[PDB]
Amino acid sequence: PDFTKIIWPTVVERNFSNPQSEITTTLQELYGDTFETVSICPPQSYGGELLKGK
Amino acid sequence: PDFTKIIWPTVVERNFSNPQSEITTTLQELYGDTFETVSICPPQSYGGELLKGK
Fold it and tell me: Which compartments does it reside in (chains A, B) (predicted)?
């Protein structure tokens, strides 16, 4: 290991690695983490996609 | 055939039998008879049947 170490320029710095999080004082079923994805859904019973062709 | 002819009481009288109708002075493709049935159709892209369950 010397100055001839090749450097790969990345934007991800190791000043914040894997942020673990653990439940301590209660039950999990009382404290849940949800991971969702907020996408756009047209409504079920109406929305311009029913007029397609009409 | 005498007075003991059994009579079946029907409401259909034979004072107007099969009304034939024939095209005379032109072509059929220029004079058409349509037979339709006017029933109620809910619209295609809307109508309460889309809200069924919602």
Answer: Virion
- CB B42 within 8 Å of CB B49: yes
Resolution of this structure in Å: 2.9
Residues of B in contact with A44 (CB under 8 A): 50, 54
Return all residues near B49 (Cβ < 8 A) that are at least 6 apart: B42
Q: How far apart are CA A20 and CA A35, in angstroms?
A: 15
**Obtained via which technique?**
cryo-EM
DSSP state of A48: G
Coil, strand or helix at A30: helix
Residue of chain B whose Cα is closest to the Cα of A51: B45
